[PDB]
Amino acid sequence: QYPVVDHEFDAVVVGAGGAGLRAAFGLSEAGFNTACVTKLFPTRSHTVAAQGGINAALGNMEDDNWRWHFYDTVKGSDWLGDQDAIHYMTEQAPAAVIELENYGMPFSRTEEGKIYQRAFGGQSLQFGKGGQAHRCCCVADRTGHSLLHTLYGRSLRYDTSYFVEYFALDLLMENGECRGVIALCIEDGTIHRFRAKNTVIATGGYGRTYFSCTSAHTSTGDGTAMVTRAGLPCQDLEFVQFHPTGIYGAGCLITEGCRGEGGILINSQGERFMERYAPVAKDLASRDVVSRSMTIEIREGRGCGPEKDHVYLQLHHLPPQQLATRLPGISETAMIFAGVDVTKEPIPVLPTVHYNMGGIPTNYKGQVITHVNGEDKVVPGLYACGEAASASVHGANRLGANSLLDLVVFGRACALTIAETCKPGEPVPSIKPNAGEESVANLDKLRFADGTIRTSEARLNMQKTMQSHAAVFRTGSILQEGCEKLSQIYRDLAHLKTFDRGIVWNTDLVETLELQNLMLCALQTIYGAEARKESRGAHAREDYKLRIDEFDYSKPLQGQQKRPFEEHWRKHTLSYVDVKSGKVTLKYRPVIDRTLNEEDCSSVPPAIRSY
Amino acid sequence: SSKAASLHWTSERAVSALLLGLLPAAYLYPGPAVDYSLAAALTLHGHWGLGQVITDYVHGDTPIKVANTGLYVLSAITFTGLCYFNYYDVGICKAVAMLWSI
Amino acid sequence: ATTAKEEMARFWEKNTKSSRPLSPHISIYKWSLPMAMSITHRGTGVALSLGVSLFSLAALLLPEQFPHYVAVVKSLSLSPALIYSAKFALVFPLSYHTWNGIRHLVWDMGKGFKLSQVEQSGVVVLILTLLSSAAIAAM
Amino acid sequence: TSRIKKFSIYRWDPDKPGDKPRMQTYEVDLNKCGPMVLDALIKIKNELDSTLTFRRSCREGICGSCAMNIAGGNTLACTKKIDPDLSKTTKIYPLPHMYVVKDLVPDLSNFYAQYKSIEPYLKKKDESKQGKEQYLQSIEDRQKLDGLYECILCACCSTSCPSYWWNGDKYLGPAVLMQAYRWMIDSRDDYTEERLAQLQDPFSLYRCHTIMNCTRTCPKGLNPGKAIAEIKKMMATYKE
Numbered sequence A: 001q002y003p004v005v006d007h008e009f010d011a012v013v014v015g016a017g018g019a020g021l022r023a024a025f026g027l028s029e030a031g032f033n034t035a036c037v038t039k040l041f042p043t044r045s046h047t048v049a050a051q052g053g054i055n056a057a058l059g060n061m062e063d064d065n066w067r068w069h070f071y072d073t074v075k076g077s078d079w080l081g082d083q084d085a086i087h088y089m090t091e092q093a094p095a096a097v098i099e100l101e102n103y104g105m106p107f108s109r110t111e112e113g114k115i116y117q118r119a120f121g122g123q124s125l126q127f128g129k130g131g132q133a134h135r136c137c138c139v140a141d142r143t144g145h146s147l148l149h150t151l152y153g154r155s156l157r158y159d160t161s162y163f164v165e166y167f168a169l170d171l172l173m174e175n176g177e178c179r180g181v182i183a184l185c186i187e188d189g190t191i192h193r194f195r196a197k198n199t200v201i202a203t204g205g206y207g208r209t210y211f212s213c214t215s216a217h218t219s220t221g222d223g224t225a226m227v228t229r230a231g232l233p234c235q236d237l238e239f240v241q242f243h244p245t246g247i248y249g250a251g252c253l254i255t256e257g258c259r260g261e262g263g264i265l266i267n268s269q270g271e272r273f274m275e276r277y278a279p280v281a282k283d284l285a286s287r288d289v290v291s292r293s294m295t296i297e298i299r300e301g302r303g304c305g306p307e308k309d310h311v312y313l314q315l316h317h318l319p320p321q322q323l324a325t326r327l328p329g330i331s332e333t334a335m336i337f338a339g340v341d342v343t344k345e346p347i348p349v350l351p352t353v354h355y356n357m358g359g360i361p362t363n364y365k366g367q368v369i370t371h372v373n374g375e376d377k378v379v380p381g382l383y384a385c386g387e388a389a390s391a392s393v394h395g396a397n398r399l400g401a402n403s404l405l406d407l408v409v410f411g412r413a414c415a416l417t418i419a420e421t422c423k424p425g426e427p428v429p430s431i432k433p434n435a436g437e438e439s440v441a442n443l444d445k446l447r448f449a450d451g452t453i454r455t456s457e458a459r460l461n462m463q464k465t466m467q468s469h470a471a472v473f474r475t476g477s478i479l480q481e482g483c484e485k486l487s488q489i490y491r492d493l494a495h496l497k498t499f500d501r502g503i504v505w506n507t508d509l510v511e512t513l514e515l516q517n518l519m520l521c522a523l524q525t526i527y528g529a530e531a532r533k534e535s536r537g538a539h540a541r542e543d544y545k546l547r548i549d550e551f552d553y554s555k556p557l558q559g560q561q562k563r564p565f566e567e568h569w570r571k572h573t574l575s576y577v578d579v580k581s582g583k584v585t586l587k588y589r590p591v592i593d594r595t596l597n598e599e600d601c602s603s604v605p606p607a608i609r610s611y
Numbered sequence B: 001s002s003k004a005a006s007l008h009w010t011s012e013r014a015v016s017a018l019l020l021g022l023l024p025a026a027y028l029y030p031g032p033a034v035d036y037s038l039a040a041a042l043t044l045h046g047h048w049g050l051g052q053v054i055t056d057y058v059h060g061d062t063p064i065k066v067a068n069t070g071l072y073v074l075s076a077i078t079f080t081g082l083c084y085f086n087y088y089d090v091g092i093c094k095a096v097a098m099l100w101s102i
Numbered sequence C: 001a002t003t004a005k006e007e008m009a010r011f012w013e014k015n016t017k018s019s020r021p022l023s024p025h026i027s028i029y030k031w032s033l034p035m036a037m038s039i040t041h042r043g044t045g046v047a048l049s050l051g052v053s054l055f056s057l058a059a060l061l062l063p064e065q066f067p068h069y070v071a072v073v074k075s076l077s078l079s080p081a082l083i084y085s086a087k088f089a090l091v092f093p094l095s096y097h098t099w100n101g102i103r104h105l106v107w108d109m110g111k112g113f114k115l116s117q118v119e120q121s122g123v124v125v126l127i128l129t130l131l132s133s134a135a136i137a138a139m
Numbered sequence D: 001t002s003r004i005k006k007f008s009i010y011r012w013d014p015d016k017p018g019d020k021p022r023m024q025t026y027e028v029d030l031n032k033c034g035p036m037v038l039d040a041l042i043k044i045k046n047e048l049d050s051t052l053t054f055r056r057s058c059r060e061g062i063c064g065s066c067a068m069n070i071a072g073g074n075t076l077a078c079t080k081k082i083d084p085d086l087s088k089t090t091k092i093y094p095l096p097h098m099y100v101v102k103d104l105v106p107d108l109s110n111f112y113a114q115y116k117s118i119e120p121y122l123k124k125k126d127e128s129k130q131g132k133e134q135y136l137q138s139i140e141d142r143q144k145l146d147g148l149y150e151c152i153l154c155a156c157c158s159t160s161c162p163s164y165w166w167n168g169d170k171y172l173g174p175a176v177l178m179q180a181y182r183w184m185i186d187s188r189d190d191y192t193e194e195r196l197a198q199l200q201d202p203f204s205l206y207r208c209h210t211i212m213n214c215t216r217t218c219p220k221g222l223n224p225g226k227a228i229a230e231i232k233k234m235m236a237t238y239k240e
Ligand SMILES: *Cc1cc2c(cc1C)nc1c(=O)[nH]c(=O)nc-1n2C[C@H](O)[C@H](O)[C@H](O)COP(=O)(O)OP(=O)(O)OC[C@H]1O[C@@H](n2cnc3c(N)ncnc32)[C@H](O)[C@@H]1O
Pocket: A014, A015, A016, A017, A018, A019, A020, A037, A038, A039, A040, A041, A042, A045, A046, A047, A048, A049, A050, A051, A052, A053, A054, A143, A144, A166, A167, A168, A169, A202, A203, A204, A205, A214, A215, A216, A219, A222, A223, A253, A354, A355, A385, A386, A387, A388, A400, A401, A402, A403, A404, A405, A407
């Protein structure tokens, strides 16, 4: 009933955001016959909406050191970051940004002609001792727009084979190795199997598990769901980042660059309250701390607007020429989506779901790992990078301007690792003649679903549940009710209802597939949350307010009994789902503390984390 | 030339500007010089102009060739008749004045 | 792995043999004054050329010369308001086309491309066309 | 208690043999809907007719996905306010003079292939230093890119231009030409003369007759008409 088209490549890259594009043409540049499968035309990917910039220790504004950036990130991750990946990411950052400028990325410029860099949240000089860093490289407040358009422009020079508006359905697994992906061609309704020696998953995040997010409608955790359906673990999915300043109402992002250029958060009584919550960093503290502070002001009665449900981001004290040069994008967006003239009046903002710290666990080389009897084991032929991956360079809380960096550093890493491990033209592995049939069986079932709960109605129930139960602050009983409700919704997917019985551009069907995907991500996110009985980074349990490491690092370690692995929480969550039932199983794996080179870059031991 | 398209674009603007200068010339110095310049400028500007309309709206190798061939005939006959009028009759400037004395 | 030329070829190959419709354009698109004035510039240009070409044919083919036809027209003692209306009708397209032609030549120098200026210059063109036509037809 | 707004939306199903394009009217309560047309489209799809098909992603006017013809003009549904005059029905059409894949989804791959054809990426004569050091560019030369690099490739402009309607096979259209100019005046780029040489034919550039529908329609407030006129000036003044 469905005609299947078979393809053979050296490498298939799923996703064409910043990470997938960089991975894909890096592979072609390395001589690999490479397919890139994307459900969007590449420049529509959520990366296009990125704003404030990309970190790299170029030293264009003051003397810098990539090791300071390493330190910032490790402290930002709240010691759930793998420090070997962070070493790799922050040491590669200057070269990676320079690679982008040399591609033609139209960076804003200094008087010396070099890439202009701005301050951003949680970044410092001298390993936390030397004051505010200025290492966020940017194209005004449109950095992601230019990054993606530059990467897409660059990709056109190579023989990469693009499969645009193809929806990836599942991985093709055999004996623990990935053999490729199966996908739906949205333009003509045909099923396509992409056989390849190496598959790279760069499918972005899943902010749309919630009711309010900065994410595109297309951030539905598709590659994450595919890993889950492959019987593989996802990692740290409970760590969801609330960006401090999504615009009130529409939820659009207002860059942290506003605060990096001088903007301040004020409440209903005019107080710049971050001076009280984070006396040093103020409005440039880490996002988990700012988002938590904003939330406390609102629920403690100092919220702004007629409903007392948001706070103000004030920019008008800043010279209007600086606003026009540094923040044009949010200047137009604030007028469109809030009728606000930023040179006269503040922007209404509240913490908004923005970014997924968790994802597909990889090593620092991009290789997806599983974890069996206390040992990380690379999943052969499978890679992940970008927001869909958990490398984990962000651990429990990402620094602003570190994601776009992650994208191009680890996208390239995936290409480099395949190139140092495989040769082009090596025999593409066979797949059984009916590989992927179950993906088609599922798609067909949705296409003709005639139950009692339409897709929009289940999706809204998921989003409201996540919003009310897995928010900035959490507690056990509310998380448990969120778990119960979400498992109920998952069972109710049996009563799903579609109407479009076509196959060509059936977005009714495609969005029901996305709902299946979101649901698998949401189920792991909230059950992970309920079981993590500690507070770390963006995961704040008001019933477990302390960070629980293997030592109490607030006191001298001299004479301390190390806590057993099972009795502390400085460990990654690993989550599995029995897709048939929706049952979530959890396991844990240690955080990597070693760097790539101890003499070049010290491992940073866990410490009290304050801004 | 390898720059045939931009040179043609430039020639069009130049002839448009030339024709524009001939209108004061016809009012202020009517005579054989202006009469024949108008004959030349009016034919060339209209020919290039009608050529742009053909390029926009006629498609297919044969209909394109047919339209352009008929345009050459139309332009060649138009220039011939305007020179004819200028030589054997009162000429463009005088004819306009005579028309306007009605 | 496909060049731009191959992509364009496949587009036309795919779509012309498809059952896909062409979305509407001229029947549904909203008009503006610059758009109306742009095509009137083309329509007056073409009409002026056809008028010049018909005049040129008449010089080659008619058995009488121009002073005879002027004398004939005067012999009909047409009304002054009807003479004025024919003069105005004759000079209006030349007038429109000339002024808007000047506007085009300013654009070719790179000036007046702000949309608000495109509107200003169009309205300026219309009032000059009107004034010059009324003034010329009164001569 | 409610404000019923009427939308009349173009429909065509390729999976119905012999289906003919038609308009379908939906009624939306503006009191229970966001302010933008995409908000109404999404509300209709979720609540009244999940077969209604359109492209969208960012809903803040940066990805360019949702370009369509709303009330006779090409715009982004996600930044185009809903007209609250309840006595007017808003008509919604696909981008004009495009092949319709389904409902409001047009085939943009010719548009993309034209963009690919101008090589929209930095080119230096000596690229052996690719990736060692940042290229220097003054604040003044970087300012020349403002108004150009912001394009989101939504194709609103090109599908509003009548010259692209009649000759979109060979005329690059305003979106692609303005990107060609974006690379011509990038001071880091060494291929200005070659980029101009590509447009030495009757169609690629010179089907533009300064209609200026493109600049009027651009959801980003850009001026592709002006950029085209600067190209034309460069075409006439460059040597070899
Ligand atoms: C939401 C957001 C995030 C953001 C930001 C502003 C906004 C509004 N600003 C940032 C910034 O200034 N600096 C920074 O470091 N980060 C910023 N972020 C976060 C960052 O933009 C994102 O995390 C990042 O861009 C994610 O990029 P990535 O390449 O990982 O993924 P994507 O751009 O979201 O694209 C996903 C691609 O995958 C394809 N896909 C998805 N599902 C499928 C299926 N089923 N089949 C095929 N392909 C699929 C999509 O097509 C897309 O191309």
